[PDB]
Amino acid sequence: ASDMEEKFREAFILFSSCSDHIEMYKFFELMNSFGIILTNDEKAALPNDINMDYWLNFAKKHYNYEQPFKHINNVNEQVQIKIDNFLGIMKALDTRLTESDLNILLQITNPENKSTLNLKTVSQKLTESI
Amino acid sequence: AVTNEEIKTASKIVRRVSNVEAFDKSGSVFKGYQIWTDISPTIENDPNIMFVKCVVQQGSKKEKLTVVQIDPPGTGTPYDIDPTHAWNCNSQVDPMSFGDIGLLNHTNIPCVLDFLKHRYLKNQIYTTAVPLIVAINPYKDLGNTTNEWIRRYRDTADHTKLPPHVFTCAREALSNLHGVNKSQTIIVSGESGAGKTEATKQIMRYFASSKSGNMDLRIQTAIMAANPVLEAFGNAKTIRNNNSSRFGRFMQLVISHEGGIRYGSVVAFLLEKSRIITQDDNERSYHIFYQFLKGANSTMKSKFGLKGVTEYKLLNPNSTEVSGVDDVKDFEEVIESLKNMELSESDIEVIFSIVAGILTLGNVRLIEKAAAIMDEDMGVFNKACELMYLDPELIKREILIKVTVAGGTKIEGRWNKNDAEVLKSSLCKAMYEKLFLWIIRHLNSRIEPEGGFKTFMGMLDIFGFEVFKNNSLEQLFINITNEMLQKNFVDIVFERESKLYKDEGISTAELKYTSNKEVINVLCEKGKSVLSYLEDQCLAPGGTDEKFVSSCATNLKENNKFTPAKVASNKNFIIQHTIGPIQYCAESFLLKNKDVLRGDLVEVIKDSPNPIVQQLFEGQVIEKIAKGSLIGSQFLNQLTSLMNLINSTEPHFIRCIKPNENKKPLEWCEPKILIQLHALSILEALVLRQLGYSYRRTFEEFLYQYKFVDIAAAEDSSVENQNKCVNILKLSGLSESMYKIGKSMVFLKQEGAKILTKIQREKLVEWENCVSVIEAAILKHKYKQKVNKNIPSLLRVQAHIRKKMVAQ
Amino acid sequence: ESDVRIYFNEKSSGGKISIDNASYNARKLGLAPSSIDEKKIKELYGDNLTYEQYLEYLSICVHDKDNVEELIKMFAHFDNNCTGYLTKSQMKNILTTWGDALTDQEAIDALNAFSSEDNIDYKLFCEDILQ
Numbered sequence A: 001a002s003d004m005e006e007k008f009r010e011a012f013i014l015f016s017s018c019s020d021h022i023e024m025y026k027f028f029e030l031m032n033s034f035g036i037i038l039t040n041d042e043k044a045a046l047p048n049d050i051n052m053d054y055w056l057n058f059a060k061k062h063y064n065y066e067q068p069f070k071h072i073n074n075v076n077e078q079v080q081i082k083i084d085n086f087l088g089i090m091k092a093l094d095t096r097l098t099e100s101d102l103n104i105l106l107q108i109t110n111p112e113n114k115s116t117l118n119l120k121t122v123s124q125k126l127t128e129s130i
Numbered sequence B: 001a002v003t004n005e006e007i008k009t010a011s012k013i014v015r016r017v018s019n020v021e022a023f024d025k026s027g028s029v030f031k032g033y034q035i036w037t038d039i040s041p042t043i044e045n046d047p048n049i050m051f052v053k054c055v056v057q058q059g060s061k062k063e064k065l066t067v068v069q070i071d072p073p074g075t076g077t078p079y080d081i082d083p084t085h086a087w088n089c090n091s092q093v094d095p096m097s098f099g100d101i102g103l104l105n106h107t108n109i110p111c112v113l114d115f116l117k118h119r120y121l122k123n124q125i126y127t128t129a130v131p132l133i134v135a136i137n138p139y140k141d142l143g144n145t146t147n148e149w150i151r152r153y154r155d156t157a158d159h160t161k162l163p164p165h166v167f168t169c170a171r172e173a174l175s176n177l178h179g180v181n182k183s184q185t186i187i188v189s190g191e192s193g194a195g196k197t198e199a200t201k202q203i204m205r206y207f208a209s210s211k212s213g214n215m216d217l218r219i220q221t222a223i224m225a226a227n228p229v230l231e232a233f234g235n236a237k238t239i240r241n242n243n244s245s246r247f248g249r250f251m252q253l254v255i256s257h258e259g260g261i262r263y264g265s266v267v268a269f270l271l272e273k274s275r276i277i278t279q280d281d282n283e284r285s286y287h288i289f290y291q292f293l294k295g296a297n298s299t300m301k302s303k304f305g306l307k308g309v310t311e312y313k314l315l316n317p318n319s320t321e322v323s324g325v326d327d328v329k330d331f332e333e334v335i336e337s338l339k340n341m342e343l344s345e346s347d348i349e350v351i352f353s354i355v356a357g358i359l360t361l362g363n364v365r366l367i368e369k370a371a372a373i374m375d376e377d378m379g380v381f382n383k384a385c386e387l388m389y390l391d392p393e394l395i396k397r398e399i400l401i402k403v404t405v406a407g408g409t410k411i412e413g414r415w416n417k418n419d420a421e422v423l424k425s426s427l428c429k430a431m432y433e434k435l436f437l438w439i440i441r442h443l444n445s446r447i448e449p450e451g452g453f454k455t456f457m458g459m460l461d462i463f464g465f466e467v468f469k470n471n472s473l474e475q476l477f478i479n480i481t482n483e484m485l486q487k488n489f490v491d492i493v494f495e496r497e498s499k500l501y502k503d504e505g506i507s508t509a510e511l512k513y514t515s516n517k518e519v520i521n522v523l524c525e526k527g528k529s530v531l532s533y534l535e536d537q538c539l540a541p542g543g544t545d546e547k548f549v550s551s552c553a554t555n556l557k558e559n560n561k562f563t564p565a566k567v568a569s570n571k572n573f574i575i576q577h578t579i580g581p582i583q584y585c586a587e588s589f590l591l592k593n594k595d596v597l598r599g600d601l602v603e604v605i606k607d608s609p610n611p612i613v614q615q616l617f618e619g620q621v622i623e624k625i626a627k628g629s630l631i632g633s634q635f636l637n638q639l640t641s642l643m644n645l646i647n648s649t650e651p652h653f654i655r656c657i658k659p660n661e662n663k664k665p666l667e668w669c670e671p672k673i674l675i676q677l678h679a680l681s682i683l684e685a686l687v688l689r690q691l692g693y694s695y696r697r698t699f700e701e702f703l704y705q706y707k708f709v710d711i712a713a714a715e716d717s718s719v720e721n722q723n724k725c726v727n728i729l730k731l732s733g734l735s736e737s738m739y740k741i742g743k744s745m746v747f748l749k750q751e752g753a754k755i756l757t758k759i760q761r762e763k764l765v766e767w768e769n770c771v772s773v774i775e776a777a778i779l780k781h782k783y784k785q786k787v788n789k790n791i792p793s794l795l796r797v798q799a800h801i802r803k804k805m806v807a808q
Numbered sequence C: 001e002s003d004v005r006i007y008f009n010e011k012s013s014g015g016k017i018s019i020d021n022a023s024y025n026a027r028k029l030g031l032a033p034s035s036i037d038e039k040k041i042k043e044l045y046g047d048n049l050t051y052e053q054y055l056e057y058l059s060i061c062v063h064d065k066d067n068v069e070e071l072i073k074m075f076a077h078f079d080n081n082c083t084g085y086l087t088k089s090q091m092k093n094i095l096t097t098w099g100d101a102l103t104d105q106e107a108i109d110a111l112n113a114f115s116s117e118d119n120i121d122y123k124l125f126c127e128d129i130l131q
């Protein structure tokens, strides 16, 4: 079964500030927080004024129920990165995450002080914290 | 409250610089691309809003954008703007996550306004634009200046993990003072109501907080007691400020490295004497008058024969009570502060005798008889002179008897009623001003170091540039002061950057400097200046405002900085100040400049038997008219001394902003705020910091930040860190003009740094999806967390809803 | 204090009162219990209170700290531009998603009874229900 509508709905209003419409930039964040990635051409074909019901229908169709965070780490393939390297990549790609948010991530996904972060463990921890 | 003048001038400050990149390679609009625009019915209908947020619509052409407004909420209607009316947007950026405006990717005007607005609305009113600090009046107690917050800002280990604050400025100034044995000045400026007085008072309280004790507590107490006293005698309720400082204040302080004021000095200049005689409707005179009449006990009333606040010619009877001001409680505090300044009980009685005498002199009526005192007021005149310890007969003679020099003989005549009223008023203003200056002089003899200041903390609190449509002599003096301080500001910015370049072997040829010495000359130069021809016309036997204007117009044809006015060219002229052209009206310039008590009345006062009154004009020279008798001549002397002192210190600038003219918290008036950003050189400070090689990080920081530009070059054990950076920059695509290698730091132009960022992002294209999903998932979690904080409150709303449902 | 006792006697079976009726009694009495109070009183005495314990519960439901400044905390959080207003849909979504969530008709009915226009002064909405 595994119905996701109550979580899809709460996330929408979290990114839309409780309005039934969400701006396009905020919509990209919303869908990304469920592992959903669109191409540029798919992005172009979206409505310009995305409302709750559109998202609830889009999420049902695009969300990966078996592997929510497949784009962090794909189980259907045959992964690790040094911490300061991983942080550097976040900063290079200009992340909205403050210095504290990064620290919660790092102790969540990596409890020890290993010099190196398992991307499969990140997708594991984030699937739990949905 | 937004006038059309403000909308007009605000619109001239607006400039389009960077261009919008709304289209991709293929020519299609980026889905959801947001811009700022100044074209919107919202703006037509609400003069508080200068810019709105839109998204460019799919199908837009390059020559003409089609947008839909999204913030504030609109209709969903598409409309067309020319690209020169579109500014870039800092979408997806937390304004509370860093404190300098310069760290935004786009620093255009609507971006700057929005960054400060959203900080202002979350009660973070301090933002830096290095080296300037920006402070927006919240018009309420934020609660972030308590003793607990002083201790927190003083005692936190690393100064940089606290948000910007006035305490951060105090802490840095005192740290540099004790770190390198260098004097500092903290210059607080801005317009009436911008919070200058509170900033100054908060910084003094920081300075007065010591880790463990101040054995010089006696002197710090006298210095902290100067605030109530200086406000009672120098502050007044105006239309726009219930507590406006009507004098310029400069202080020098000696402060232990762990807090605690050990010595001080106080300087007050350009007191608004005219306020002693008349006030506009809904304005008061200086607080002390109302504090004294309302607060004096019955014995004090008996003593000086005091009447009610409404019963005095010098005090506006319709405006004697101010909402939210307890003049009686303020008198109790002023009396305690005077005692804390080590004035005796009899010093204090003399001080209030003189105030009572000034007020009583204002009640004396003159008549045309020649002039004479009304017989009904012969006793009132006598009591007023006894209260000021002056000779009533001799004071009378100087007010009613005139001595002219005709040919070369003295001739005794009579002042008429008007001229005799001018004399009486001048005595009231002069006694009040010298009493105010005497209190400061007395305080200084208790708090100053005997040998003068070796190393000191200076503190200046002044109006910034003031621009009305009709600007008088008072605005000219203010605006001359702020030209000197502008030179201080661009001098320090240039000296600091030039030293950094020279310390790293970078060339300083491409450094920029916008000197304002030419406008300082046209205003101040000894031979050929406005202030010179003002002085000349004042000493001239038949000088006039119009003649003064004429001498300027014919002798200053040698710089742009003086521009003869268009309409009513006589009695009007324009100066090309650093912030733009300002129009002045020469009416009463000579009157105002000569408003200094001179002549025999001064010698009568110096022959008072009372030693305090002897000291009011002590040392002052007898008076033809001399330049020591002109406000403008004496002020340029003061101002030059003051600036020579400040110029020898490391300066700190706090620029105070008034966000609306209603004294309302959380109300944002974009046109007024934009006009102040321009006047306080905040926009200039952003430009200045981006010029030349504005990015400077050390080899190890440059390598950590730009590692993935050329990961092979950066992860090479064979080459040193200096050469690694060279290899990165040589292979990255940057032109050699966009970077220089220093002794220890990589120097990048702003443009080169943004290209280097975009080149590194292209190398990390395969992390885009992964980093987007990690970021977003945590963003969701932080949003729910922010919601979880408030659920206890929401449970109360839901509980009271279910209650109301039962009641139905 | 008299009304307390009549309301108890209307709903009391066998001298004890259920928590649901005790919460209805408390709203009838002008008080605003939440599930937090109802959980605290379950931990102590279960789902049926004696008149003594029923009184203790009414005591718990007082909440003196209740004022406009406190109730508006969640609405202000979503008022990004500090206009003091939120739309009806915004407040309906808040009221029906987190906390002791109302049903959708319950939220709608409460906002429609306060105002007929879409944008609601949430400071005045919270004041109005506080009586």
Ligand SMILES: COc1ccc(C2(NCc3c[nH]nc3-c3cccs3)CC2)cc1
Pocket: B245, B246, B247, B248, B249, B269, B270, B271, B272, B273, B461, B462, B463, B473, B474, B475, B477, B478, B479, B481, B482, B592, B631
């Ligand atoms: C005739 O000359 C004047 C000029 C100004 C004043 C008053 N301004 C004094 C002042 C108060 N705050 N800051 C200042 C100054 C800043 C820089 C120079 S003065 C009150 C207007 C009075 C007489």
